[PDB]
A paper describes a structure:
The mammalian SLC13 proteins are members of the larger divalent-anion sodium symporter (DASS) family. Each protomer consists of a scaffold and a transport domain. Structural information, along with cross-linking and computer modeling, indicates that DASS proteins operate in an elevator-type transport mechanism (Reyes et al., 2009; Drew and Boudker, 2016; Garaeva and Slotboom, 2020).
With two carboxylate moieties at approximately the same distance as those of native substrates, we hypothesized the terephthalate would bind within the VcINDY binding site, while its large benzene ring would provide stronger electron density than succinate, fumarate, or malate. In the transport domain, the two carboxylate moieties of the bound substrate are coordinated by two conserved Ser-Asn-Thr (SNT) motifs, which also form part of the Na+-binding sites Na1 and Na2.
Residue numbers in the entry:
A (entry chain D), B (entry chain C): 18 to 462
Write the structure that this text describes.
């Protein structure tokens, strides 16, 4: 009776159809049928992303592709645990309030100017998003933005409160492209091609440094009237208490080890997934230093995304085991040889940068990263490029709300019009397809 | 400065000490030192049970016992997922309120007699604990018990209102011994020795059927004055609404497949961990039938216990890989050959039935199930008996509060005295050491 129950029944139909009617070797048929089923279920979201994630292995198992335990072992990939480490580190500095003090101390560095207010609100929302989350950084910044934009309260003077709102809703998403913790897509790419933390930082941090100015510029050079106004610094100030310095010390030490993981590990006996060990060590320090309780981390952690990761890796392996990756490589051979690698990575970047407006950031990465990384592997090219590209572009949702939670968080402020966002995002999208295809060309040799 | 920070530093000391001073082959030294370390950390709970669980693999990995991915793969054992299935099934019937309707419908079957009120309160707390939880069943029953024991309000007539509180807090723990879902210890045993759902039911359900009467009898023939009183059925009645019949249908179907798993699976192609597939199927049906949302399952699920399961299996494998199981088997060879299997399982049943009063039921199972199962395996005896025994006896916490959450839940009713419980529990413990050593002898050939 409900829309989604219908999308589900239509997808079951589509599967049965493709299964019986496709004229290929059985394994390719099964792999294609499964790929389509999941693709639909994840783009429509008729079932929750996490339930479809759980649906992947139970199919693999019933259709004999894998044995139950082999299929489940995917959900314990080391990147999943690294991400759980970043979740506990965020839980820590939130329960401790080190995000509030990092907001105030930087925000009150601007003495009383709305000019240098919003610029620090974006630089903070971004710097905080590198480590915490996106939905969380945006929902945490919203009160500080509405707090600042209350002196210029005139909402007949609207264009101030869209520049300063959409700015943070974008600064959180751009800040999520800086490190392996931040947005799930990065983790799905890292799990697919086997990236370390410092590897994905060598990629994403440059792209974030470039895209945050370009995005503020684009919001600016629409309708910005904010070189005027004054500050209302209204609330109790902050002060470093029972080891907010401890939370900082652990955080700092952890991020240090994450950056210098390559030489420390090489000069330690070369452990297997050093970054994951560091993340679990973080959880341990944070628990021994008494600084955060487990109930906190259990609330903060989005276990549904951790299950998603696994479902995505399982899908990748289903495509390999069934040969659907080699089959699609053969089917695209003539197209990719008639196109350039420029053309290709432009088509990819565009396709995702716009698909992410209609569907979930992570659902889109979870679908496209496997397919592309595995086809690229069937072409015998290093899948890193396509995977990182897709993962970055999936976090470039700027048009309508519903694209990402930050958009619908700053949108529910009953002020910003649908059309305004729909056309600033339409400019920033092309801007990114540009910046991305550029950098992806420079990171070649 | 804090108690637990000291317990931790003293345990790190104990480890370093045992490590340097024990005079055995290096692997046995490392395995023993680790066993002691974890043992302490889990019995004292200086760190949260789940943080110790995470501590097990990071040690195994740094001390070269396993590779990071091998050690982590333990956290994706199929029993973990079966338990997550039972968590989603509980989330479903709680969010749906089918536990309230099952309480009301049975409670209002007793017309107006306090005699047949408390007896049905115990039969319900027990039947519900089979599937839901223990801490949860107790906290959900407390308002219904205080609701009934409000007509006999006289708390100078205390021993009525203590009998029914301790009564239900015991019916929850005994009901937790009936099925693989219920109490984690059962799941840790099932994960260690490889039990199916219908296997652990063939064991525990008899024991619960026996132990619930014996426990009501023992509470009765202390100070029971309840053949008097009348009922106050005060609250809005219940009625089967938007598919509480659906939730019932799925529940029933799931439990049916779990019971009949052996022939269905044999007559299906013999899938590997069928019960786990049934549990994930439950999560899927419950999501397609729209009957429960994922946010609900994410709140209900105790992800910390699911991580514990894994850490405990990892410990077991550390004992095997280091040969500490064979070493302790050799060290106990003369003791166990000078003892009978009666003597042995009496010492075990006693030891745990009383250790479980001082430390967490599941922390106790996670520690003792590995050590014992693996030593029994070095003696080449089927480890099932000792493991199931330990798991049942660990759920036989009846004395002080703090033993189990149900005890401390009915204890916080600012009414039941410390001494009263300490001596009903002191009788019920021996009663169990009896019943258990008995049944454990009958289940031999
Ligand atoms: O799929 C989505 O819509 C999505 C999920 C998570 C995040 C994040 O917190 O980084 C952003 C977007
Ligand atoms: O470790 C404990 O004290 C304990 C944990 C869980 C349960 C349960 O809900 O079955 C009972 C007791
Ligand atoms: Na982030
Ligand atoms: Na999106
Ligand atoms: Na139970
Ligand atoms: Na206990």
């Amino acid at each position: 009776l409900h829309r989604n129950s219908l999308i589900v029944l239509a997808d079951v139909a589509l599967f049965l159809a493709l299964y019986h009617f496709l004229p290929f070797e059985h394994n390719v048929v099964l792999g294609i049928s499964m790929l389509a089923f999941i693709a639909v279920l994840w783009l429509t979201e008729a079932l929750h992303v996490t339930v479809t994630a759980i649906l992947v292995p139970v199919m693999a198992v019933f259709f004999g592709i894998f044995e139950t335990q082999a299929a489940l072992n995917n959900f314990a990939n080391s990147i999943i645990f690294l991400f759980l480490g970043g979740f506990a580190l965020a839980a820590a500095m939130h329960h401790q309030g080190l995000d509030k003090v990092i907001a105030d101390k930087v925000l009150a560095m601007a003495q009383g100017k709305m000019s240098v207010a919003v610029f620090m609100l974006f630089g903070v929302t971004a710097l905080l998003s590198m480590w915490i989350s996106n939905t969380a950084t945006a929902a945490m910044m919203l009160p500080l933005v509405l707090g600042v934009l209350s002196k210029v309260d005139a909402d007949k003077q609207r264009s101030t409160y869209v520049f300063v709102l959409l700015g943070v809703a974008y600064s959180a998403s751009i800040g999520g492209i800086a490190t392996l913790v931040g947005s799930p897509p990065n983790a799905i790419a890292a799990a697919e091609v086997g990236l370390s933390f410092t590897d994905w930082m060598k990629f994403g941090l440059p792209t974030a440094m470039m895209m945050l100015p370009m995005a503020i510029a684009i919001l600016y050079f629409l309708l910005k009237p904010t070189l005027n106004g004054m500050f209302e610094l209204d609330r109790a100030p902050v002060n470093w208490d029972k080891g907010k310095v401890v939370t900082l010390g652990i955080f700092g030490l952890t991020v240090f080890l994450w950056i210098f993981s390559s030489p420390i590990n090489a000069a330690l006996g070369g452990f297997k997934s050093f970054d994951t060990l560091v993340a679990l060590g973080a959880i341990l320090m944070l628990s021994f230093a008494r600084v955060v309780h487990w109930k906190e981390i259990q609330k903060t952690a989005d276990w549904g995304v951790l299950l998603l990761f696994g479902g995505g890796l399982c899908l990748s392996n289903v495509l390999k085991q069934t040969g659907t990756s080699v089959f699609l490589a053969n089917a695209l051979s003539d197209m990719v040889s008639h196109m350039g690698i420029f053309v290709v990575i432009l088509v990819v970047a565009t396709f995702v940068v716009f698909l992410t407006e209609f569907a979930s950031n992570t659902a889109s990465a979870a679908l496209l990263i496997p397919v592309f990384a595995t086809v690229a592997e069937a072409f015998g090219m290093s899948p890193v490029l396509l995977s990182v590209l897709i993962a970055v572009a999936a976090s470039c949702a700027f048009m309508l709300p519903v694209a990402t939670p930050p958009n619908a968080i700053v949108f529910a402020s009953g002020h910003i019009k649908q059309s305004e966002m729909m056309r600033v995002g339409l400019y920033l999208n092309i801007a990114c397809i540009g910046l991305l295809t550029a950098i992806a060309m420079l990171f070649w040799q």
